[PDB]
């Protein structure tokens, strides 16, 4: 049977974790190719020479600050820090499931890189590493698929709070009351990256398509990420999308939206006393990505605004740094954690497609 773990959104870091074993948790990194943790004895180095297929695979996607028995280079996806580590046998201890509820305890053997404790900085308290959920052979979903004899496919239901859901191994998508009409869009494999990409052909703010340059939105132009809570936008998309958003927001006897000094890392922030609300969250312009397949990925206030401190909420679209406007090697859009929250997401790397069911307002991933 597929393997089920509960997902926690850590309040301090906004990162999502699952229990791994021994009260240790791992951070879900949907663009990460490795599982890595700190280790002690009883995670002994595997019998893996550095010319074998497994070792070259473990080093297939070197992190920027890292060139090249086996030694892999685990990467902290928040700080960008990396370090040399050995591959070792470890246990992923969870439950099986016949849908969404636990059935039996299960202990799944997986290969993880053993990282030094310094690599834990910027991760949640109680986390000992990172669970990579990218499309590559040593990521957690692929390893669960081979060890538990289930599908190379996983489901995420990331919570805003309370326990969400991660299921590794496929089967029918649970909660048909919410997912029976689940839309799908193709997963696009990009050269040199294990990450999950999809294709948006349009972006709409309110009911009005955002004018983007020709070719700006391309095949595989939207990446998925759990590293940040907000969306990153390449500059050529950032400018027209933010201008459309701020103009529409400004045009809504209640207070009129009032901009305030930005709180890093955000660029555009508002006095929360000047924002309304509705059943989707803050009453700000809806944003939709029209995806290949004909369905839209929707953002409402709960997805497009981040509460940063008392009195201030920031727009969850942040301009990429170090990427020129119109640079097709970079994604146009990187969706983040708060835009995936309260969606049931079916990452099917066998059929190469992503199912995305936004839950209706009266429910959510937490407690599902």
């Amino acid at each position: 049977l597929p393997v089920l773990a509960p997902v926690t959104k850590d309040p301090a870091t906004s990162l999502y974790t699952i229990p791994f074993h021994d009260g240790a948790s791992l951070v879900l990194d949907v663009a990460g190719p490795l599982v890595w943790s700190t280790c002690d004895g009883g995670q002994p180095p595997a019998e893996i020479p550095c010319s074998s297929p497994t070792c070259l695979l473990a080093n297939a996607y070197p992190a920027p600050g890292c060139p090249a028995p086996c030694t892999a280079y685990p990467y902290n996806p928040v700080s960008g820090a990396c370090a040399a580590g050995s591959l070792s046998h470890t246990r992923f201890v969870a439950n099986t499931t016949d849908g969404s509820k636990p059935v039996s305890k299960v202990n799944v053997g997986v290969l993880a890189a053993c990282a030094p404790s310094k690599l834990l900085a910027s991760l949640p308290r109680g986390s000992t590493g990172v669970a990579g959920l990218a499309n590559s052979g040593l990521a957690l979903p692929a390893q669960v698929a081979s060890a538990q004899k289930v599908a190379n496919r996983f489901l995420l239901c990331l919570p805003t709070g309370g326990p969400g859901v991660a299921i590794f191994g496929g089967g029918p998508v649970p909660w048909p009351q919410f997912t029976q009409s689940m839309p799908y869009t193709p997963l696009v494999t990009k050269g040199g990256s294990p990450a999950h990409y999809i294709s948006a052909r349009s972006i709409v703010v309110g009911d009005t398509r955002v004018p983007v340059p020709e070719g700006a939105l391309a095949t595989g132009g939207v990446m998925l990420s759990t590293r940040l809570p907000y969306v990153l936008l390449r500059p050529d998309v950032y400018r027209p999308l933010m201008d459309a958003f701020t103009k529409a927001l400004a045009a809504q006897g209640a207070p009129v939206a009032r901009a305030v000094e930005a709180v890093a890392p955000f660029g555009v922030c508002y006095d929360t006393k000047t924002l309304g609300n509705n059943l989707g969250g803050y009453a700000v312009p809806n944003v939709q990505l029209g995806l290949d397949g004909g369905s839209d990925w929707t953002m409402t206030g709960k997805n497009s605004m981040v509460d940063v401190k008392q009195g201030t909420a920031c727009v969850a679209f942040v301009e990429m740094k170090g990427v020129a406007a119109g640079d097709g090697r970079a994604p146009a859009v990187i969706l983040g954690g708060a835009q995936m929250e309260d969606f049931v997401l079916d990452f099917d790397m066998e059929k190469k497609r992503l199912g995305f069911s936004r839950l209706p307002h009266f429910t959510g991933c937490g407690g599902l």
């Binding site: 709070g161 989707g280 209706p360």
Partner: protein, 182 residues
């Protein structure tokens, strides 16, 4: 009392029409919806007044509710008294509080905690209450006081109401509704 409040969350996903003075609204979504809407009519401030309604409600092909819908300010709560529904019964998933009998049927009662979710005061943690009619119907009188009194045994404020409407909600599939609140 006379209608003074229009509930319109994503009414634009179908054809929402209403007339506050006549107490009527209709919502057609026969082309289907792929997002959640909640539409209806009622009052800026709810009360324990009985609500009498008549409806044509066709939702066999939809995940949908026909329900009294509203909020309580404190303790913060979202609630539904579901008179009829489509392909999903909302007390299947939730913590049971037993039953309450009102207006000719047993209702199943359930509750849930809603953590860090949208509310009438922004992102919040609050309680949700459902009463779901066992013998579904599309017209009658809802003696809301009977529901509110029972939920008050389980944390419902039963006072300090925010808005309260007769509503149609759907988030999948296709259907139609026409409602009169007498």
């Amino acid at each position: 009392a006379g209608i003074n409040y229009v509930q319109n969350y994503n009414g634009n996903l179908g054809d929402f029409t209403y007339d506050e003075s006549a107490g009527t609204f209709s919502m057609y979504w026969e082309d289907g919806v792929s997002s959640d809407f909640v539409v209806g009519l009622g009052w800026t401030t709810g009360s324990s007044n009985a609500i009498t309604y008549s409806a044509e409600y066709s939702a066999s092909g939809s995940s949908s509710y026909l329900a009294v819908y509203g909020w309580v300010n404190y303790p913060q709560a979202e609630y539904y008294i579901v008179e009829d529904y489509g392909d999903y019964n909302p007390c299947s998933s939730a913590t049971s509080l037993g039953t309450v009998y009102s207006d000719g049927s047993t209702y199943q009662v359930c509750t849930d905690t809603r953590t860090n979710e949208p509310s009438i005061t922004g992102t919040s943690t609050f309680t949700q209450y459902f009463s779901v009619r066992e013998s579904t119907r599309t017209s009658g009188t809802v003696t809301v006081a009977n529901h509110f009194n029972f939920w008050a045994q389980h944390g419902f404020g039963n006072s300090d109401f925010n808005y309260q409407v007769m509503a149609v909600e759907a988030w999948s599939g296709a259907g139609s509704a026409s409602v009169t609140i007498s």
